[PDB]
């Protein structure tokens, strides 16, 4: 959350329908438009920003909200037209050795 | 690992969009069609309606 990627992806056919079968996601809320109509909207470049938070903090990621992570590590203004895709990864990112 | 849901590692990824004064690149899936024989039909080849 303090060092999150800012992948600037462009020059491709963004097929959001494929993302519904890549990984078992648990959240596909898109604030901007509908995913069906998103496949017909052109864009210059998409900024992919990924991080890892707890479950009870997933609700804190919103276009404008207070919280321990919402305003201290990553904040979204009231113009975010993307999605808040998130998923649990408690299969390979948790070992009993000291995290 | 021996915990419950709610305090587990959840990977959250956002995809911010932008539209500046530059030609767009990532439009989306270009749904094509098949090829018909000689017949009075509509064509939309590369936007040529």
């Amino acid at each position, epitope marked *: 959350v303090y060092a999150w990627n800012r992948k600037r992806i462009s020059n491709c056919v963004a097929d959001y329908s494929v993302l519904y079968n890549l990984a078992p996601f648990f959240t596909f809320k898109c604030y901007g438009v509908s995913p069906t109509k998103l496949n017909d909207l052109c864009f210059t470049n998409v900024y992919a920003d990924s991080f890892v938070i707890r479950g009870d903090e997933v609700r804190q990621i919103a276009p404008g909200q207070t919280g321990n992570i919402a305003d201290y590590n990553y904040k979204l203004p009231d113009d975010f037209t993307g999605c808040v895709i998130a998923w649990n990864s408690n299969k390979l990112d948790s070992k009993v050795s000291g995290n | 690992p021996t915990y*419950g849901v709610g305090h587990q590692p959840y990977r959250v990824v956002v995809l911010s969009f932008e539209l500046l004064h530059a030609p767009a690149t990532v439009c989306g899936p270009k749904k094509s069609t098949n090829l018909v024989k000689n017949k009075c039909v509509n064509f939309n080849f590369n936007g040529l309606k």
Partner: single-chain antibody
Amino acid sequence: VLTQPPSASGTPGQRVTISCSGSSSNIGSNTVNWYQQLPGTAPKLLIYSNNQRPSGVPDRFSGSKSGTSASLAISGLQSEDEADYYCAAWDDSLNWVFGGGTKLTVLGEVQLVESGGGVVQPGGSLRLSCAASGFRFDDHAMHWVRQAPGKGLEWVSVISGDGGSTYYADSVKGRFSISRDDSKNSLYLQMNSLRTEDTALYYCAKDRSYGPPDVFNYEYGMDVWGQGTTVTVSS
């Protein structure tokens, strides 16, 4: 609001297609859930998230979300598939809209039992109890899905597994209080301002998610139901 065929038909051997139409505010931004209920017994989950199926549900059912509507398909139906089909969707206005039911008739282990019904004096009411047996109540959310005798189902209230923010319906808001306790698996729902229009079963539905079904718009579902009591106020 969801549009669904009230009572369709079909012939054995071939396949049918039950549809559920909805606006982009509920279906276009979330996932439709298909529930199957046999006449007489408690309902059960059929299709969740429009892509996966429970372990008990075989491959005889399939669902698609092409566009803003959901489409069901039953390849090779039989007499055992004669049940009621309900569509459910969480709208972005903090509500859970259910379907009406599809009479697809063709003429050729943790218990979630709850109680606390009984006829009472109109105006007031009593508490609604619920219980289970070792199912990790802290890591699961609970719903109140009542069903009037002969009518369809509708969502009343929902409490998350964390025990914080809970949601109520558009008609039961304010006069209802849902909460839990630090004791064994239980759920306390107090009702107020009884208007005699509450003749239902009040299914204490078990879920699989942790938070309220507003942030997790792709994992929210509903686990095995439970035998509910028949509360008939009748004024």
